[PDB]
Design a protein around this ligand. Structure first.
Ligand SMILES: CCCCCCCCCCCCCCCCCC(=O)OC[C@H](COP(=O)([O-])OCC(O)COP(=O)([O-])OC[C@@H](COC(=O)CCCCCCCCCCCCCCCCC)OC(=O)CCCCCCCCCCCCCCCCC)OC(=O)CCCCCCCCCCCCCCCCC
Ligand SMILES: CCCCCCCCCCCCCCCCCC(=O)OC[C@H](COP(=O)([O-])OCC[N+](C)(C)C)OC(=O)CCCCCCCCCCCCCCCCC
Ligand SMILES: CCCCCCCCCCCCCCCCCC(=O)OC[C@H](COP(=O)(O)OCCN)OC(=O)CCCCCCCCCCCCCCCCC
Ligand SMILES: NC(=O)C1=CN([C@@H]2O[C@H](COP(=O)(O)OP(=O)(O)OC[C@H]3O[C@@H](n4cnc5c(N)ncnc54)[C@H](OP(=O)(O)O)[C@@H]3O)[C@@H](O)[C@H]2O)C=CC1
Ligand code: SF4
Ligand code: SF4
Ligand code: SF4
Ligand SMILES: [Zn+2]
Lengths: 94, 44, 176, 206, 95, 144, 114, 154, 154, 294
């Protein structure tokens, strides 16, 4: 950021870019190293009522595998065939 | 009042990502012309 | 959604073919690359002047361990062994017994700093903020034995670094 | 419910239908088909059916599992056939995954699946190295991860964590030597299991 | 409370010190035995007893969430103080 | 501008107190920049800042030439920075201990020590527990 | 009690593979000593090969014999192709191990192990 | 484990604003360099069918024209809520995989820009203390919290 | 004469510590932090520590990562090939004492079982700065040498 | 036994052998083998060194963490000797030099220094003392090295009467100055292997009957010096110093049947034919055994 006008012009010309607008060295734009204290929010289970654990217990809703066939009609695929991808409209080609 | 890291109201400004390699220089015709002109001046 | 990175057809007009011939014979794109390294030569380097200047760090930084006290000077650690239990590397070894005043305190608190992975799980598990990873990262030693910390070494680290440790905890404890 | 993983009945039904589809087509080899509560389809087969079942899943027009994501083994010492061999396959055409499992013991060879997937070459070498399962007709079966001359198969449940030998440099012989393992600090075994049952849904009949 | 043994070695707060015939003290020759001089047992014994006007008092160790888990201490016995099990601070009921 | 560049180079010689002071910092720290003095610690280390430098070079310390009886004119160590300035120098905070002093505790070290490895003050580990099993001591009198 | 074989249907064919492996190991020893510049003799190397073969002389299961030959052939390939280094070849001889006591009294004096 | 410290997203934005220029400089050194192309073009050609059967994944597939990216076909977390393009090669060589990786760097910036704008409020770990440890302030006041903290860390 | 020997010792010590050419055994993640020490922010080359040196031209070996049993003979071979004086810097917990993998069947519990070690850098990984601190600590160790002084009292 | 020196473990690197040994002259040829064998079994080794710490680095990998301890010492300073030995159960003296120097002649290194270590060790209550002398030590030798050895062997015996004195013939090994000496170029020689000498020293520490005894460590066979030197050239494929060193080489190795040898300590002497290649391989530029006197 302290480079002379000539040196700024020289390196801009050699690179073909406006290097001064996107310097890779950080100056004052960074955020201050001392910040005000946070006050973080709480989750949906922070309630005083209507909040029994048995109604929100994910682990106890897990089940053993469903056995569809044990040793003791239209054809099907594991899922529908995947759909063709669409070419990008942002920039289809490099 | 809750305070956590959040984007500014209205979001951040646009960020560039697409390749930007500008075109520079003369055409092949002009470059050969300068080269050949330099040779002829030197020969002379 | 997808894009092609290299699906293109060069033009085969004379102007285009002559453009590519000139690039081949005059090395134009090589000369262009020279321009970019030239631009860097005149940029200010990113190097900092270590050890007179230091790379920036945050209050969460996980460095050398220390054992902390209450303001009265009493040890915070009450030999609960949660740190030992959680330690992914089994780097902590603890023995405890009733102190002469009946207090629940450790008689051994070792951290093998060459087993430790500096993960910070011990300071998460501690219920009393007794064991922390401090901000010091400049404690390399000339021998392996010097990195086998016992309770005396760790208490001395706490007394040595408490001024900074307490301030760092003050900055980050509302995130925990 | 914010903290509970949502179910997907459409995928569960689709995978159940395809599981039956496979069982009907290869009854010679399929022993069990199950779909887990998070929608993963497992086909358990007799080990004779490795090549036929994998070939069908790779090549059948209604399957097209062209990608072997992974092939590994699990050691379960309480079983008569302690080693469970697991194939995880991916079908790009149908955007689906499937798991094929079979079994073997320390002395029974499994047919190498390199003919079906070239990916299997190194995966089967790793299984041989870590579990000692021999694969028949492998193009080049040999250790891959352990040191040369290493004795035993480390990933077996009865192989000790720290092994039997350790290395150091010995100045008298001017080379690295192997010696029986001694540890300055023994690894501390922890008994962590709670004596109270956690998951009634998985309780076994008494 | 760093006391020293007859052989000159400092005694730690855990009471450790190599005895006379122990070869292991050779490790300190040409170096030093690291000892922390601030004995927490002697430091907590300096704090005064807090006089309170209730049968039950609570201690979180000070500093709110920066202290220890909050515990409640009964002060019914009049022949001794109530001691916090976490930080060692003492309490006594007035009158 | 080349004259302004050269004038600034000359102003560093005067900013360091003359040629001798300019050369001392050039050879001690390989740096002749002039900053603003933020403060000095009890060991003699001096702390400077220049917010016009890029992040990382905007704060630095010129180490004291003697610390705890050790000549540090040429032998400077990163561990000579005391904890209260350590936080400021590594940008863990914005405020130096001259503006926001650390909390005082009786048990905190009054004198910072640098890395003591390789010296007679080095740490030597040892077991902190007492002997576990007591052996029987035979009687001192004879009677077999 | 009916099992799928590895290579051999019975002990008779297993023993044929064992002998072929022994011949390959026997003939390889002179090259190994020279290639790895070992400080043992060819007799010492061939004695070790016999010692390694003899410790498995009690196997009556053709499947176990088959795996032993498979592992022995793997061990030979590593040596012939110089995937092993000097340290790997010389590990068979344990020249930094002090001979552990054998009789009851010697074991009684040193510790508690059997 | 923890929420973002205040001021971090501002600095990520500042980093991201300038990064595509850094990618451009890297491209100026390699993308059209004839030496770079001679070293990479037509080197290590892998066909689409060989890539799938050998178990390849990622750019090793996309370099050969296979249209596959798990962030699109089998999305996880919130990847279905961001927009981005999957780079695809045409020759299946080292040069095309180099171009894919460079372009994927640009698409990562595009995604990062969207994450910064769409970052929502709320807690950052599941509010189920039988899985995720409670906050330290809760652990030091509430009995259930202390028990669950104790058991989760032992 | 003691004044001449003391000055000659200082000269050779200064040259050897001002020109440390490292051979990096980049075995695992600790190698990445070594890369960041060579990178622009810390620029180890500005201390006279060249980026990379062949074993026959190196003065210091940096063991940056886990040393497995399979790898140990190779590392010892390279150490034996280094011309003297040679120094070894052990970087990170794995190299220092096995670290996270201390109890594995396949890992050397500290590279100091294979080679003599001059400096131990703690961390998993040590920061690039912490490694630089260790290198500067190795330099001070070399500054303490008195090889010619001890030679002339033989 | 004090509780800290009761042996534990299986005799490996992390075991406790119960030996606390100070090894003087540990940084030379014989020292490195002795320290290696002590550290192999988990002994506490104290290494007093005169040289740079850089020259002690090869000893560090020889012991588990903490078992090798280094100290500065000076042969002329009894305070430094006392610091090194006062915590030990055994003191081993391997100090010596094959040549004289301006600061240390043979009388200083083979008489004064051994006497100082023996006396200080005696005062400090050290129970075991192992002193290396020489097979051809002789008060009337033509070599001043061997004359000083005989004087020092006498001084150590009277100063530390329980000392174990070991008298090895010329020792050969990778770092010797015997086979290497010939390779870098009337009398019968009986050279002994380096590892046999080490095993003998280690067994002497553990043998209570070794206290107060004098041993002679010799090789299994006797050779004519000419035939031996011829053999060395053949092994090295080589086509077939100080004046004092030449005297010792030309001294016929004494036969001393009245002293116990390696056999009395449980060590089987190693023939020179099994180990010459190991030593002499480095001398080849990329064999009929020598005739043995019976
Ligand atoms: C051809 C070389 C031209 C020589 C003159 C260069 C010069 O002085 O311009 C600096 C000046 C500052 O450039 P900048 O990049 O913007 O500086 C960043 C800050 O603004 C800088 O601002 P600042 O705030 O940091 O200013 C303070 C700084 C400012 O320091 C200075 O004032 C720079 C002093 C440099 C003196 C160079 C003398 C040149 C002698 C010619 C022969 C040299 C080669 C032989 O003070 C110092 O640090 C002085 C410390 C001493 C520096 C030691 C230099 C000695 C070198 C000569 C040794 C001869 C023996 O440049 C200009 O203003 C443009 C005109 C310069 C010509 C540029 C043409 C391109 C250069 C081609 C060289 C390619 C080889 C690589
Ligand atoms: C042949 C003649 C070549 C002489 C080379 C001159 C070396 C000068 C020198 O040592 O640099 C100063 C150096 C500078 O000291 P320094 O290397 O410790 O530098 C300290 C500054 N930092 C922390 C940034 C590295 O002086 C010395 O190191 C003391 C030894 C002097 C050696 C010369 C005495 C003869
Ligand atoms: C009037 C009638 C007059 C008659 C005479 C007229 C003649 C004029 C017209 C002809 C001009 C010819 C120019 C001669 C230069 C050499 C040309 C050349 O060979 O370049 C091509 C060469 C190979 O090309 P490539 O793309 O790799 O493959 C092509 C094969 N299929 O590619 C290369 O060689 C590239 C070089 C690789 C090394 C790169 C490092 C150098 C880059 C910096 C160069 C700086 C410029 C040099 C200045 C020197 C100053 C002393
Ligand atoms: N090797 C042989 O052929 C035989 C040797 N011996 C005896 O065995 C012992 C060792 O043999 P070897 O190992 O070959 O001898 P080395 O020369 O190889 O080792 C000599 C040791 O003595 C130390 N030393 C020498 N002079 C002094 C001194 N003035 N002050 C302090 N330390 C000193 C050296 O330390 P530094 O490295 O610091 O110089 C080194 O550690 C000697 O007593 C030798 O006479 C006996 C018979 C045969
Ligand atoms: S930082 Fe992690 S590995 Fe190190 S002591 Fe703490 S819990 Fe154990
Ligand atoms: S440091 Fe904390 S977690 Fe570890 S034993 Fe002490 S009180 Fe428990
Ligand atoms: S010490 Fe940590 S960072 Fe370094 S190699 Fe080991 S695990 Fe990776
Ligand atoms: Zn309290």
């Amino acid at each position: 950021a302290s480079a002379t006008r000539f040196i700024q012009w020289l390196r801009n010309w050699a690179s073909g870019r406006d290097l001064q607008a996107k310097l890779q060295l950080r100056y004052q734009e960074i955020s201050k190293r001392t910040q005000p204290p946070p006050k973080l929010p709480v989750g949906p289970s922070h309630k005083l009522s209507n909040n029994y654990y048995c109604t929100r217990d994910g682990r106890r809703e897990a089940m053993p595998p469903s056995i569809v066939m044990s040793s003791q009609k239209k054809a099907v695929s594991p899922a529908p065939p995947i759909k063709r991808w669409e070419l990008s409209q942002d920039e289809p080609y490099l | 009042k809750v305070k956590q890291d959040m984007p500014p109201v209205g979001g951040y400004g646009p960020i560039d990502y697409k390749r930007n390699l500008p075109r520079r220089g003369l055409s092949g015709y002009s470059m050969f012309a300068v080269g050949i002109g330099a040779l002829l001046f030197g020969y002379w | 959604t997808y894009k092609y990175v290299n699906l293109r057809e060069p033009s085969m007009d004379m102007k285009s073919v002559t453009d590519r011939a000139a690039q081949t014979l005059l090395w134009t794109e090589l000369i262009r690359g020279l321009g970019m390294t030239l631009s860097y030569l005149f940029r200010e380097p990113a190097t900092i002047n270590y050890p007179f200047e230091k790379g920036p760090l945050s209050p969460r930084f996980r460095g050398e361990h220390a054992l902390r006290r209450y303001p009265s000077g009493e040890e915070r650690c009450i030999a609960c062994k949660l740190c030992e239990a959680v330690c992914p590397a089994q780097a902590i070894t603890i023995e405890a017994e009733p102190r002469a005043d009946g207090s629940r305190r450790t008689t051994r608190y070792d951290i093998d700093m060459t087993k430790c992975i500096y993960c910070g799980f011990c300071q998460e598990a501690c219920p009393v903020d007794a064991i922390v990873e401090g901000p010091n990262f400049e404690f390399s030693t000339e021998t392996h034995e010097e990195l086998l910390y016992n309770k005396e070494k760790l208490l001395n680290n706490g007394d040595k670094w408490e001024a900074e440790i307490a301030a760092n905890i003050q900055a980050d404890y509302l995130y925990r | 419910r914010p903290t509970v993983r949502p179910r997907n009945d459409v995928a569960h039904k689709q995978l159940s239908a395809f599981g039956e589809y496979v069982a009907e087509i290869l009854p010679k080899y399929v022993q069990q088909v199950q779909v887990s509560c998070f929608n993963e389809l497992e086909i358990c087969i007799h080990p004779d059916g490795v090549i036929p079942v994998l070939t069908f899943l790779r090549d059948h027009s209604n399957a097209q599992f062209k990608s072997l994501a992974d092939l590994t083994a699990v050691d379960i010492p309480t079983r008569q056939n302690r080693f469970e061999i697991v194939y995880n396959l991916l079908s790009l055409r149908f955007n689906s995954r499937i798991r094929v499992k079979t079994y073997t013991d320390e002395l029974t060879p499994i047919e190498s699946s390199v003919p079906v997937y070239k990916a299997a070459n190194w995966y089967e070498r790793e299984i041989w190295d870590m579990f000692g399962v021999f694969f028949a007709n492998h193009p080049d079966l040999r250790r891959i991860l352990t040191d040369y001359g290493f004795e035993g198969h480390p990933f077996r449940k009865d192989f000790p964590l720290s092994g039997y030998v350790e290395l150091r440099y010995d100045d008298e012989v001017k080379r690295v030597v192997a010696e029986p393992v001694e540890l300055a600090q023994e690894f501390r075994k922890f008994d962590l299991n709670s004596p109270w049952e956690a998951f009634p849904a998985y309780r076994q009949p008494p | 409370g760093v006391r020293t043994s007859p052989t000159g070695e400092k005694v730690t707060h855990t009471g450790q010190v190599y005895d006379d015939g122990d070869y292991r003290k050779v490790r300190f020759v040409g170096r030093q035995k690291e000892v922390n001089e601030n004995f927490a047992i002697d430091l907590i014994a300096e704090q005064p007893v807090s006089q309170v006007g209730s049968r039950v008092i609570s201690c979180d160790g000070g500093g709110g969430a920066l202290g220890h888990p909050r515990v409640y201490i009964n002060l019914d016995k009049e022949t001794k103080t109530g001691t916090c099990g976490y930080c060692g601070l003492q309490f006594r009921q007035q009158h | 501008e080349l004259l302004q560049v050269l004038k600034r180079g000359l102003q560093q010689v005067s900013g360091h107190g003359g040629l001798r002071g300019y050369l001392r910092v050039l050879f001690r720290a390989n740096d002749v920049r002039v900053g603003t003095l933020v403060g000095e610690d009890k060991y003699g280390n001096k702390y400077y800042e220049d917010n016009k430098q890029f992040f990382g070079r905007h704060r630095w310390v010129i180490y004291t030439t003697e610390m705890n009886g050790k000549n540090t004119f040429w032998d400077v160590d990163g561990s000579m920075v005391p904890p209260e300035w350590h936080r400021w120098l590594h940008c863990m905070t914005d405020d130096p201990p001259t503006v926001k002093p650390p909390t005082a505790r009786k048990f905190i070290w009054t004198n910072h020590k640098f890395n003591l490895s390789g010296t007679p003050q080095q740490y030597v580990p040892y077991s902190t527990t007492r002997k576990k099993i007591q052996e029987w001591v035979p009687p001192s009198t004879p009677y077999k | 009690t009916s099992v799928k074989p590895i290579f051999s249907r019975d002990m008779n064919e297993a023993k044929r593979r064992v002998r072929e492996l022994y011949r390959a190991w026997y003939r390889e020893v002179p090259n190994t000593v020279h290639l790895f510049q070992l400080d043992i003799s060819v007799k010492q190397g061939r004695d070790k090969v016999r010692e390694m073969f003899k410790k498995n002389a009690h196997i009556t299961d053709p499947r176990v014999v088959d795996l032993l030959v498979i592992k022995g052939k793997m061990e030979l390939e590593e040596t012939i192709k110089v995937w092993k280094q000097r340290t790997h070849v010389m590990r068979f001889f344990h020249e930094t191990e002090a001979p552990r006591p054998k009789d009851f009294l010697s074991k009684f004096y040193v510790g508690h192990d059997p | 484990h923890q929420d973002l410290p205040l001021g971090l997203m501002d600095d990520i934005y500042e980093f991201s604003k300038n990064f595509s220029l850094r990618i451009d400089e890297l491209e100026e050194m390699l993308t059209n360099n004839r030496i770079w192309r001679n070293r990479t073009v037509d080197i290590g050609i892998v066909t689409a069918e060989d890539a799938l059967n050998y178990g390849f994944s990622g750019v090793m597939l996309r370099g050969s024209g296979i249209q596959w990216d798990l962030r699109k076909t089998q999305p996880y977390d919130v990847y279905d809520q961001v927009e981005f393009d999957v780079p695809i090669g045409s020759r299946g060589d080292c040069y095309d995989r180099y171009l894919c990786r460079v372009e994927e760097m640009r698409q990562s910036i595009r995604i990062i820009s969207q994450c910064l704008n769409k970052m929502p409020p709320g807690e950052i770990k599941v509010d189920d203390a039988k899985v995720s440890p409670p906050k330290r302030a809760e652990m030091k006041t509430s009995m259930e919290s202390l028990i669950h903290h104790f058991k989760l860390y032992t | 004469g003691e004044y001449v020997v003391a000055k000659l010792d200082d000269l050779i010590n200064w040259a050897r510590r001002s020109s440390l050419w490292p051979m990096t055994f980049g075995l695992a993640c600790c190698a990445v932090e070594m890369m960041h020490m060579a990178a622009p922010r810390y620029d180890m080359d500005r201390f006279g520590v060249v980026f990379r040196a062949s074993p026959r031209q190196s003065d210091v070996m940096i063991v940056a990562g886990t040393l497995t049993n399979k790898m140990a003979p190779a590392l010892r071979k390279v150490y034996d090939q280094m011309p003297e004086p040679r120094y070894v810097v052990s970087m990170g917990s794995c190299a220092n004492g096995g670290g996270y993998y201390h109890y594995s069947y396949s890992v050397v519990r500290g590279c100091d079982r294979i080679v003599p070690v001059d400096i131990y850098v703690p961390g998993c990984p040590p920061t690039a700065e912490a490694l630089l601190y260790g290198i500067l600590q190795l330099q001070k160790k070399i500054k303490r040498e008195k090889r010619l002084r001890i030679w002339y009292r033989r | 036994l004090h509780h800290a020196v009761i042996p534990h473990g299986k005799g490996g690197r992390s075991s406790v052998s119960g030996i606390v040994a100070t090894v003087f002259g540990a940084t030379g040829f014989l020292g490195r083998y002795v320290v290696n064998h002590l550290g192999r079994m988990g002994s506490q080794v104290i290494v007093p060194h005169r040289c740079e710490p850089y020259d002690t680095m090869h000893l560090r990998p020889m012991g588990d963490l903490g078992q090798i301890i280094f100290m500065d010492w000076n042969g002329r300073d009894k305070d430094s000797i006392r610091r090194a030995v006062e915590h030990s159960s055994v003191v081993i003296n391997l100090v010596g030099r094959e040549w004289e120097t301006q600061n240390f002649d043979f009388e200083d290194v083979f008489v004064k220094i051994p006497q100082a270590i023996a006396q200080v060790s005696k005062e400090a209550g050290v129970e075991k003392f192992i002193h290396i002398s020489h097979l051809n030590a002789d008060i009337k030798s033509s070599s001043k090295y061997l004359r000083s050895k005989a004087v020092g062997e006498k001084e150590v015996r009277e100063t530390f009467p329980e000392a174990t004195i070991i008298k090895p013939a010329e020792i050969f090994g990778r770092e010797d100055r015997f086979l290497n000496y010939f390779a870098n170029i009337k009398t019968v020689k009986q050279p002994v292997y380096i590892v046999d000498v080490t095993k003998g020293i280690i067994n002497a520490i553990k043998d209570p009957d070794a206290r107060g005894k004098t041993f002679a460590f010799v090789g299994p066979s006797r050779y004519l010096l000419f035939d031996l030197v011829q053999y060395v050239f053949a092994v090295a494929h080589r086509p077939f110093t100080t004046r004092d060193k030449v005297e010792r080489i030309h001294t016929t190795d004494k036969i001393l049947p009245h002293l116990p040898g390696l056999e009395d300590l449980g060590v089987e002497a190693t023939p020179l034919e099994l180990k010459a290649i190991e030593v002499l391989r480095r001398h080849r530029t990329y064999v009929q055994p020598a005739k043995t006197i019976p």
